[PDB]
């Protein structure tokens, strides 16, 4: 199976540098041009950069030309994006993608998971996780006061997915984010079932598990 696994990301100050990487498997890496595509929060997709299969030719969008460097190692099947002189406008989710080119027809058939790059001079803060507790009952977790985005939330290590709603974070008056994740369950399961939210805030390397139970 084709796989593209991205590494790197998180917080970087304006004017700073950050390197992303993309590890590939399940295809002849050197036979394909590769690209970086990004998406500013709540905005559309924007092509950033490309590199030919051999690594012989590189291409950049006007917005990043002269500040970014794309390179690849065909022996290790890795693509790199060195980003320098970072600006607030570069804050985005970045994806690496395999490109199929026939210059008339260019398209991206496989994409990595995205990684969020936040360009800010603010401090990294890990989240506090508070329980949300009171037919059908709702329970949840309030993931509070972290920076930058994002956090990932799962329930019961991923065993609980039905009826879960993980909301978009809000940016608070403090300049820190807060998000809620809820699940609806039978009220009568509250005494016998355990409901735990698993929170990961990769930018601060902080992991928190919290049981959501009635008082």
């Amino acid at each position: 199976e084709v796989q593209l696994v991205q590494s790197g990301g998180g917080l970087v100050q304006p004017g700073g540098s950050l390197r992303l990487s993309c590890a590939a498997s399940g295809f002849t890496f050197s036979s394909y041009a590769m690209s970086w595509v990004r998406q500013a929060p709540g905005k559309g997709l924007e092509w950033v950069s490309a590199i030919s299969g051999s690594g012989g030719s590189t291409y950049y969008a006007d917005s990043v030309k002269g500040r970014f460097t794309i390179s690849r190692d065909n022996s290790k099947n890795i693509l790199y994006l060195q980003m320098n002189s970072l600006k607030a406008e570069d804050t985005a989710t970045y994806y690496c993608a395999r490109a199929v080119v026939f210059y008339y027809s260019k398209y991206f058939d496989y994409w990595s998971q995205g990684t969020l790059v936040t360009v800010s001079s603010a401090s990294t803060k890990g989240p506090s996780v508070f329980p949300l507790a009171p037919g059908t009952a709702a329970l949840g977790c309030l993931v509070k006061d972290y920076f930058p985005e994002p956090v990932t939330v799962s329930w019961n290590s991923g065993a609980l997915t039905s009826g879960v709603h993980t909301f978009p974070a809000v940016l608070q008056s403090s300049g820190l984010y807060s998000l809620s994740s809820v699940v609806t369950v039978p009220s009568s399961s509250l005494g016998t079932q355990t409901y735990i939210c698993n929170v990961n805030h990769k930018p601060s390397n902080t992991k928190v598990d919290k049981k959501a139970e009635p008082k």
Binding site: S31, A33, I51, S52, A99
Partner: peptide, 5 residues
């Protein structure tokens, strides 16, 4: 064949 052109 790998070219971006």
């Amino acid at each position: 064949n790998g070219s971006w052109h």
